[PDB]
Design a protein around this ligand. Structure first.
Ligand SMILES: Nc1nc2c(ncn2[C@@H]2O[C@H](COP(=O)(O)OP(=O)(O)O)[C@@H](O)[C@H]2O)c(=O)[nH]1
Length: 396
């Protein structure tokens, strides 16, 4: 049985806790329902399905929810978006779906909860379903289940409802049982951030780095960025050999720290913070004429962060000066929800959505595409100011 991590999102009071509660209650996984729900409120929990081991890895409402999601300390394979049939899709529903998209969560399960409060009505479910479909289509999601539920009464969480014969789809627990296995780093495009560059006599130019994603084989042609962008010509060549622990390899996989000899590349053309990829799928370069959106959590700062702040960005093996161009939103670190648009400043403990401009070219990837190159730290004044994740890149 494959292990799978899930997170429950959705607007406050739409029924995330109750749904989790009901799941645990009906599968006999508790560590009257009303009593029990009280006890749970006061105090990771796993449960087992026929085909899956399921961990609820994190949840909106605790101190480090946004931090854990941003740093990748908490990582979900699927998100269950809870939407109340009474309220429908609210702004905070849209925000949370955007967050799931940003994190590269590919599988979404929607529950339309509190069906009992709208008399289990089909017309109501369909109206809300249509709102849910419009939002998730906007974000690129397709073929996700939309499940009418009453977390309080039990309908369609674990047991099939006798109150909604018009619904033919799966229950929540049946939808969780069908969460596809996580995509593997080996199947993402090759990326090798360069740690150091050596010249070995009789051999030539030998970069050293850890394969983060994809697979490097002897004979592959690799291209280096931002070296290629900086020098206005492709810095690339054939991989003649691979070594680890002073022994030959024919291929290198995610996690392998390797030396690789590249034909036709000069030692001076590549350095620390360059990244190797296939010419087919070259590492993305954010130039100084470009910008990028990021979600950050402010870990420490002596005063407050404002537009124009210019610290150092650290990602993979690179470091560059970066400028804060805009702060688009202040984000509650507990919920992941927006509490202010266009705030003037950000302080320790705040999360924010920011537009950053690299002051030197840098390889960055949106976390939704390649997370190993989409997470970064901000450093300044001898400390770690912020942890961040790349949302998107805007070319100039
Ligand atoms: N009638 C009804 N009440 C519900 C349902 N789901 C949650 N509630 C109640 O609505 C309130 C908010 O639910 P909660 O799980 O705390 O929401 P969260 O903030 O999303 O975790 C609580 O009083 C729940 O007991 C439901 O399906 N039907």
């Amino acid at each position: 049985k494959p292990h799978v991590n899930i997170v429950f999102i959705g607007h406050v009071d739409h029924g995330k806790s109750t749904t989790i509660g009901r799941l645990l209650y009906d599968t006999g996984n508790i560590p009257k329902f009303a009593w029990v729900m009280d006890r749970l409120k006061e105090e990771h929990t796993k449960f087992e399905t026929p085909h899956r081991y399921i961990t609820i890895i994190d949840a909106p409402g605790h101190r480090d929810f946004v931090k854990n999601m941003i740093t990748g300390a908490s990582q979900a394979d699927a998100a269950v978006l809870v939407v109340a049939a009474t309220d429908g899709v609210m702004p905070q529903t849209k925000e949370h779906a955007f967050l799931a998209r940003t994190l590269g969560i590919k599988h979404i399960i929607v529950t339309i909860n509190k069906m009992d409060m709208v008399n289990y009505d089909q017309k109501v479910f369909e109206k809300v379903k249509a709102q849910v479909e419009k939002l998730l289509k906007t974000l690129g999601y397709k073929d996700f289940p939309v499940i009418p539920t009453s977390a309080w009464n039990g309908d369609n969480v674990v047991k099939k409802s006798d109150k909604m014969p018009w619904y033919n789809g799966p229950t929540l627990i049946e939808a969780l049982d069908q969460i596809p296995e996580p995509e593997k780093p080996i199947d993402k495009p090759l990326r090798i951030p360069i740690q150091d560059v050596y010249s070995i006599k009789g051999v030539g130019t030998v970069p050293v780095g850890r394969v983060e994603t994809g697979k490097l084989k002897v004979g592959d042609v690799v291209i280096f960025e931002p070296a290629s962008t900086i020098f206005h010509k492709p810095i690339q060549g054939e991989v003649k050999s691979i070594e680890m622990h002073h022994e030959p390899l024919q291929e290198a996989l995610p996690g392998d720290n390797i030396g690789f000899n590249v034909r036709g590349v000069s030692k001076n053309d590549i350095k620390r913070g360059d990244v190797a990829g296939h010419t087919d799928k070259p590492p993305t370069v954010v130039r100084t004429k470009d910008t990028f959106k990021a979600q950050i959590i402010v870990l420490n700062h002596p005063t407050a962060i404002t537009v124009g702040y210019s610290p150092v960005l650290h990602a993979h093996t690179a470091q560059i000066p970066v400028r804060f161009e805009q702060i688009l939103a202040k984000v509650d670190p507990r919920t992941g929800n927006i509490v202010e648009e266009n705030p003037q400043f950000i302080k320790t403990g705040d999360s924010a959505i920011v537009v950053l401009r690299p002051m030197k070219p840098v390889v960055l990837e949106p976390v939704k595409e390649i997370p190993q190159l989409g997470r970064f730290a901000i450093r300044d004044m001898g400390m770690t100011i912020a942890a961040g994740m790349v949302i998107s890149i805007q070319k100039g």
